[PDB]
Design a binder for these strands. Sequence first.
DNA 1: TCCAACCACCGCTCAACTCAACTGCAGTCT
DNA 2: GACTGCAGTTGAGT
DNA 3: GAGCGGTGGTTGGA
Lengths: 397, 393
Amino acid sequence: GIKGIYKEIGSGERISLCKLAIDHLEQHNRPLRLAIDMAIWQFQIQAARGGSNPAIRTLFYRFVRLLSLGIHPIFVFDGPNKPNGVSTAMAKRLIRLFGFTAHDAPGEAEAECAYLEQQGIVDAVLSEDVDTIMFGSRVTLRDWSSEGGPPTHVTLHDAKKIAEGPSGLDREGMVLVALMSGGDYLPDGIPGCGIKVACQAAKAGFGKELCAITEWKQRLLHELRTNESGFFRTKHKALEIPENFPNMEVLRYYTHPVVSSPATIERLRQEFPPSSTVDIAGLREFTRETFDWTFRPGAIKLIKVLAPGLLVQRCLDRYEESTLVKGISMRREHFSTDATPELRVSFIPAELVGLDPGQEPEVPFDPWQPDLAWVPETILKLGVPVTVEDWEEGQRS
Amino acid sequence: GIKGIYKEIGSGERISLCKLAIDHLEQHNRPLRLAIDMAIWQFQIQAARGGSNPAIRTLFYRFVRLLSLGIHPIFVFDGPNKPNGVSTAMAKRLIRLFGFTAHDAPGEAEAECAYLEQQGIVDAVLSEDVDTIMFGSRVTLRDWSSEGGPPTHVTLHDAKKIAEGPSGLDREGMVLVALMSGGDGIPGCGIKVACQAAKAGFGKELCAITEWKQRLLHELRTNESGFFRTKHKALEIPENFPNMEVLRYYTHPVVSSPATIERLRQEFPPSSTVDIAGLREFTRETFDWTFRPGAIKLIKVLAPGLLVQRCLDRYEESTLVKGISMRREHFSTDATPELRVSFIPAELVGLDPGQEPEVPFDPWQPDLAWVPETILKLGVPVTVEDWEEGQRS
DNA sequence: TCCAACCACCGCTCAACTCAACTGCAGTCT
DNA sequence: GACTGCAGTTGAGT
DNA sequence: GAGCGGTGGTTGGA
Ligand SMILES: [Mg+2]
Ligand SMILES: [Mg+2]
């Protein structure tokens, strides 16, 4: 589901997640909004030794990476109305602590994700696969990973470019494919079929699928048997077709998937994105209880990990004050960001995060000394414009 | 037929021809030797269609299959001393090009095949039916076919096990059945009754003759000893019966001379090198496998079997196998252990398609084939050991 | 007379393989 | 979920 | 050459 689909639509465009975030921020003058299917974690997350709760620990670092990218994420959870070891409660707790949004689909999350995109709530979808396209996604993302090392890239699929050849596969086309082929998921699918043949049926325009039904089935069946119109590579007489085909409690499951109410969509327009303020004291207590980051070493570990992303977040949110950036020392266009212009920024971690390791019991990295980080130039111009200008001025000299 | 013989002796054991070949090779430490009656081909190969000479083409592919099985075949042809649409000359020509042996019976091929087996020239007989048992065969094979696809299996009959119940049909038993059930054979008779006369010991017949005839004739009409299911006064028996010139057609069938048997004992199996250039010219002239495509076609089809022949004939040289990838015990071979070998077809066959006039399978790229582990251990032992030890890792 | 089981006999009917492309399976990592 | 070779099938031509 | 039902004939009994 759908097995062999990337042979037809393509594997997709590998692209820096940083580039997407910054390109969108430049074109639309606001941070990228992303719907993330919570199901993508199950196998990336588990397993990743060791220490205490390494599974949710990996989730923590992914969240910090989201902060540094300046993305407004909304995490969608599955609902009971469908036809690892990481607690949902803990996941949702960490989400809120990071100032992110948790959202519960009434049914399947991937359908809700696609729906949110269609309604303009989010700009793109990050999911397990491209099932989201069947539910109406236009820009869908998968495989958030290294390009190993740090997870910097995703694989982008565009529903409009896919529909424009060579597969000619659109939403209705893929629906027919799933309806005809596998089969191992949906009832009353065709035994000998078959993504190659199904895609050929879709390309022949059969993907309508406009609710009676009796006529369509026999035109399609006659074409399969005789290949008169030449819709297929060969004839297909041995391909006998179930009486429960086309199953239609399946059909709309795709064309009208159970998603949030219109009232819920309107609530989200007003309430998403949220204030997005990272709860520092909350994260300190969470990491202590969950990761055993206890005492002064645990506080310093938190500051080190959290300071860069928190720098980005406040830099975007705040839109005389070197309260964020102490200085700039270099410029680069690195391949990991697909040559996205970044500037080498210096900052004071402990001062930025706002925790004092002295208030913690004592049982190298000094959180009070300057630390360095690469931050996208675009983000820096928005938050610390005067600092960026001074650097630009010094470079002209 | 003998008609309805199989409901008496059993339908036979269906067995992988590969299993027979490899089992015999493991037990006797030399390839299986098989006598093949050329009469089997008549109503099997004329179902092929398309192309040039599809019947002799079918014969070609089965010859290639014989190479892959590592079997040493001797094809027996009929002779004139007996009491569609394939040329004998072309059949014999192709046989020699493959390094196989062609043998002319002085009379019926079946009798000669059985005789060859009795004399130790071959280990088993492949023929149309089971008549070979009457001529003295002990292990006889029939119906070399699919188990619907490639012809991997055969039906084995064992003369010893047949004679050991429940039919009790031995050689002289089946002779009596043949004598009685027509057709100077007895009208109204009768394999059920004939087989019952056999179990009553009447199959001897060791000659004068008049006493014997009047015992079963008295038993047929009275059933005193209970030899039969019922009485049989209906059956009246011809004066000529039992026909004696028929009896020794079975007990002493016209076959090759002792001198010929001795000739075969030292000449078979033969040197047996596949004539590559010969086959190239044959397939060009007969199948219209012309120019570079025809060369490539030959190389692809012939490379695997040719690999086996080298393997067994071996009995460092990576000139056969480039590597091993996997192990399997497939049902088509009756779980005969096979290894997935890689080889270069063109390099192995030894023909360059470049010397042919050109007009997607690349014969210079590695190709894969399943080859019986036993054969591989014999021909390329060092390669097999490297695979075995990398495995236990 | 007739049936019923058994049987010999008649008339009827059938008889491969390559090749490419494909689906589906079972590994596997995640 | 998706990738890889194997296996078995089908359709078309040999 | 072999598997299928039908046919007609023989045998021993109803
Ligand atoms: Mg999915
Ligand atoms: Mg015969």
